[PDB]
Enzyme design. Structure first.
Site, PDB file in Angstrom:
ATOM      1  N   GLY A  28       0.815  -1.208   0.000  1.00 39.57           N
ATOM      2  CA  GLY A  28       0.000   0.000   0.000  1.00 39.57           C
ATOM      3  C   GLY A  28       0.845   1.251   0.000  1.00 39.57           C
ATOM      4  O   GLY A  28       1.688   1.424   0.887  1.00 39.57           O
ATOM      5  N   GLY A  29       0.632   2.084  -1.024  1.00 40.93           N
ATOM      6  CA  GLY A  29       1.281   3.373  -1.267  1.00 40.93           C
ATOM      7  C   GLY A  29       2.693   3.602  -0.754  1.00 40.93           C
ATOM      8  O   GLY A  29       2.868   4.226   0.298  1.00 40.93           O
ATOM      9  N   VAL A  33       2.154  -3.121   4.396  1.00 42.16           N
ATOM     10  CA  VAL A  33       1.330  -2.961   5.595  1.00 42.16           C
ATOM     11  C   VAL A  33       1.234  -4.285   6.358  1.00 42.16           C
ATOM     12  O   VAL A  33       0.966  -5.331   5.757  1.00 42.16           O
ATOM     13  CB  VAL A  33      -0.063  -2.296   5.361  1.00 42.16           C
ATOM     14  CG1 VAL A  33      -0.479  -1.470   6.575  1.00 42.16           C
ATOM     15  CG2 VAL A  33      -0.078  -1.420   4.111  1.00 42.16           C
ATOM     16  N   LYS A  46       2.861   0.594   8.567  1.00 38.38           N
ATOM     17  CA  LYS A  46       3.326   0.942   7.228  1.00 38.38           C
ATOM     18  C   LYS A  46       4.858   1.001   7.153  1.00 38.38           C
ATOM     19  O   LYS A  46       5.445   2.062   7.395  1.00 38.38           O
ATOM     20  CB  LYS A  46       2.697   2.261   6.740  1.00 38.38           C
ATOM     21  CG  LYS A  46       2.896   2.519   5.251  1.00 38.38           C
ATOM     22  CD  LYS A  46       2.269   3.835   4.845  1.00 38.38           C
ATOM     23  CE  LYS A  46       1.870   3.864   3.389  1.00 38.38           C
ATOM     24  NZ  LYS A  46       0.744   2.934   3.075  1.00 38.38           N
ATOM     25  N   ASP A 126      -4.722  11.239  -4.728  1.00 40.41           N
ATOM     26  CA  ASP A 126      -4.779   9.804  -5.058  1.00 40.41           C
ATOM     27  C   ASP A 126      -6.073   9.117  -4.542  1.00 40.41           C
ATOM     28  O   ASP A 126      -6.019   8.067  -3.917  1.00 40.41           O
ATOM     29  CB  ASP A 126      -3.500   9.044  -4.623  1.00 40.41           C
ATOM     30  CG  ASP A 126      -3.167   7.787  -5.451  1.00 40.41           C
ATOM     31  OD1 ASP A 126      -3.867   7.525  -6.475  1.00 40.41           O
ATOM     32  OD2 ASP A 126      -2.205   7.080  -5.092  1.00 40.41           O
ATOM     33  N   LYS A 128      -8.955   6.839  -4.805  1.00 39.57           N
ATOM     34  CA  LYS A 128      -9.221   5.560  -5.452  1.00 39.57           C
ATOM     35  C   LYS A 128      -9.852   4.625  -4.423  1.00 39.57           C
ATOM     36  O   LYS A 128      -9.765   4.916  -3.228  1.00 39.57           O
ATOM     37  CB  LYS A 128      -7.966   4.956  -6.078  1.00 39.57           C
ATOM     38  CG  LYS A 128      -6.779   4.742  -5.155  1.00 39.57           C
ATOM     39  CD  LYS A 128      -5.677   4.158  -5.997  1.00 39.57           C
ATOM     40  CE  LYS A 128      -4.421   3.930  -5.204  1.00 39.57           C
ATOM     41  NZ  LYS A 128      -3.419   3.208  -6.026  1.00 39.57           N
TER      42      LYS A 128
HETATM   43  C1  B8I Z   1      -4.885 -10.215  -3.547  1.00 39.45           C
HETATM   44  O1  B8I Z   1      -4.739  -9.842  -2.181  1.00 39.45           O
HETATM   45  C2  B8I Z   1      -3.934  -8.752  -2.033  1.00 39.45           C
HETATM   46  O2  B8I Z   1      -2.725  -8.796  -2.232  1.00 39.45           O
HETATM   47  N1  B8I Z   1      -4.629  -7.653  -1.566  1.00 39.45           N
HETATM   48  C3  B8I Z   1      -5.275  -7.727  -0.273  1.00 39.45           C
HETATM   49  C4  B8I Z   1      -4.849  -6.590   0.631  1.00 39.45           C
HETATM   50  N2  B8I Z   1      -5.075  -5.311  -0.043  1.00 39.45           N
HETATM   51  C5  B8I Z   1      -4.818  -4.152   0.842  1.00 39.45           C
HETATM   52  C6  B8I Z   1      -3.526  -4.220   1.672  1.00 39.45           C
HETATM   53  C7  B8I Z   1      -3.329  -2.951   2.482  1.00 39.45           C
HETATM   54  C8  B8I Z   1      -4.517  -2.757   3.430  1.00 39.45           C
HETATM   55  N3  B8I Z   1      -4.262  -1.561   4.236  1.00 39.45           N
HETATM   56  C9  B8I Z   1      -4.887  -1.496   5.499  1.00 39.45           C
HETATM   57  N4  B8I Z   1      -5.586  -2.538   5.952  1.00 39.45           N
HETATM   58  C10 B8I Z   1      -6.199  -2.476   7.129  1.00 39.45           C
HETATM   59  N5  B8I Z   1      -6.944  -3.589   7.525  1.00 39.45           N
HETATM   60  C11 B8I Z   1      -7.291  -4.667   6.778  1.00 39.45           C
HETATM   61  C12 B8I Z   1      -6.825  -5.119   5.525  1.00 39.45           C
HETATM   62  N6  B8I Z   1      -7.422  -6.263   5.138  1.00 39.45           N
HETATM   63  N7  B8I Z   1      -8.264  -6.514   6.153  1.00 39.45           N
HETATM   64  C13 B8I Z   1      -9.151  -7.666   6.121  1.00 39.45           C
HETATM   65  C14 B8I Z   1      -8.233  -5.587   7.156  1.00 39.45           C
HETATM   66  N8  B8I Z   1      -6.162  -1.413   7.943  1.00 39.45           N
HETATM   67  C15 B8I Z   1      -5.445  -0.373   7.501  1.00 39.45           C
HETATM   68  C16 B8I Z   1      -5.426   0.800   8.360  1.00 39.45           C
HETATM   69  C17 B8I Z   1      -4.729   1.867   7.959  1.00 39.45           C
HETATM   70  N9  B8I Z   1      -4.043   1.891   6.775  1.00 39.45           N
HETATM   71  C18 B8I Z   1      -3.376   3.129   6.445  1.00 39.45           C
HETATM   72  C19 B8I Z   1      -1.977   2.904   6.055  1.00 39.45           C
HETATM   73  N10 B8I Z   1      -0.876   2.688   5.758  1.00 39.45           N
HETATM   74  C20 B8I Z   1      -4.030   0.835   5.873  1.00 39.45           C
HETATM   75  O3  B8I Z   1      -3.467   0.856   4.786  1.00 39.45           O
HETATM   76  C21 B8I Z   1      -4.778  -0.372   6.294  1.00 39.45           C
HETATM   77  C22 B8I Z   1      -5.803  -2.614   2.608  1.00 39.45           C
HETATM   78  C23 B8I Z   1      -6.026  -3.838   1.732  1.00 39.45           C
HETATM   79  C24 B8I Z   1      -4.281  -5.205  -1.280  1.00 39.45           C
HETATM   80  C25 B8I Z   1      -4.528  -6.371  -2.239  1.00 39.45           C
END
Ligand code: B8I
Length: 266
Positions: A28-29, A33, A46, A126, A128
């Site tokens: 993520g960006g 994460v 992060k 950004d 999206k």
């Molecule tokens: C094919 O599968 C893949 O590779 N994917 C799957 C995963 N996906 C992304 C990965 C990054 C995740 N980022 C986050 N996730 C969660 N919680 C969370 C993710 N999943 N769950 C169930 C619960 N909380 C936060 C809180 C704050 N911040 C701010 C910052 N820095 C986050 O970024 C953040 C969002 C989903 C990408 C493609």
């Protein structure tokens, strides 16, 4: 914000455990994460001038529709239990489809978050669905403020499938955030990704032209993974998306008008 040591956050993530079911959620960006802990308070870590602007924005910008920054060392946030809107629209990892009722609240919440940013003279740059996160009540929370600014640039940044024509030309304007939010609204209606090589049209924003030229209807594009959409509110959200997606930036509504049209929808 709490000042953590890089060695403090190493233990919380089990020595930055990169194996997913481990601790790695995904990329993520400009970083990775990982799922971490600070007692019971589940956190997102992060692991990345660049990370100094994020804290600079997160400092003054506190809102119910913006992700909450806890601390840093790495950047630490409250872990969003329902992850990204992008993943929830694709039912990633077996999650049930989002209902139309849930989609409307998410759209309204995302618009409230953008309004707060624009009120405080900030441009996200950004917008999206991967940057729209969902808490325990599926409340929309805007994330990833690394590219955010408070005009032209030589370093063109953003996600191209979501970018306004003037943003792809180097311009920096809050009006470009409105265009990108229009692409998000289409993703919400259709449940389709903003870009797909295996598709006609490849870019989701091009369904606007297909509907305008009467080659297809909005009803042909409504996500079939819902049972509670009504044509009235769907056409009303599509109308907001269409207004946001105007090729000419000055013809686009401002975030307050977008916020008002989404409120009238329910
Ligand atoms: C094919 O599968 C893949 O590779 N994917 C799957 C995963 N996906 C992304 C990965 C990054 C995740 N980022 C986050 N996730 C969660 N919680 C969370 C993710 N999943 N769950 C169930 C619960 N909380 C936060 C809180 C704050 N911040 C701010 C910052 N820095 C986050 O970024 C953040 C969002 C989903 C990408 C493609």
């Amino acid at each position: 914000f709490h000042s953590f040591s890089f060695y403090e956050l190493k233990n919380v993530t089990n020595n930055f455990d990169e194996r997913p079911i481990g601790n790695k959620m995904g990329e993520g960006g400009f970083g990775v994460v990982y799922k971490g802990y600070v007692n019971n308070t589940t956190v997102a870590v992060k692991k990345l001038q660049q990370f100094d602007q994020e804290i600079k924005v997160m400092a003054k910008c506190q809102h119910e529709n913006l992700v909450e920054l806890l601390g840093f060392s790495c950047l630490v946030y409250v872990y969003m239990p329902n992850g990204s809107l992008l993943d929830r629209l694709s039912c990633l990892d077996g999650t049930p489809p989002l209902s139309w009722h849930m989609r409307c609240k998410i759209a309204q919440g995302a618009a409230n978050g953008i309004n707060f940013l624009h009120e405080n003279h900030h441009i996200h740059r950004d917008i999206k669905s991967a940057n729209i996160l969902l808490d325990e009540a599926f409340t929309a929370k805007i994330s990833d403020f690394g590219l955010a600014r408070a005009v032209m640039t030589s370093r063109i940044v953003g996600t191209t499938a979501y970018m306004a024509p003037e943003a792809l030309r180097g311009e920096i304007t809050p009006k470009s955030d409105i265009y990108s939010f229009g692409v998000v609204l289409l993703e919400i209606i259709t449940g389709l990704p903003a870009v797909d090589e295996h598709r006609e049209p490849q870019l989701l924003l091009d369904i606007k032209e297909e509907i305008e030229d009467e080659e297809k209807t909005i009803e042909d594009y409504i996500d079939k993974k819902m049972n509670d959409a009504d044509s009235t509110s769907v056409e009303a959200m599509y109308s907001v998306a269409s207004q946001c997606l105007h090729e000419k930036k000055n013809k686009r509504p401002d975030i307050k008008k977008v916020q008002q049209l989404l409120q009238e929808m329910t």
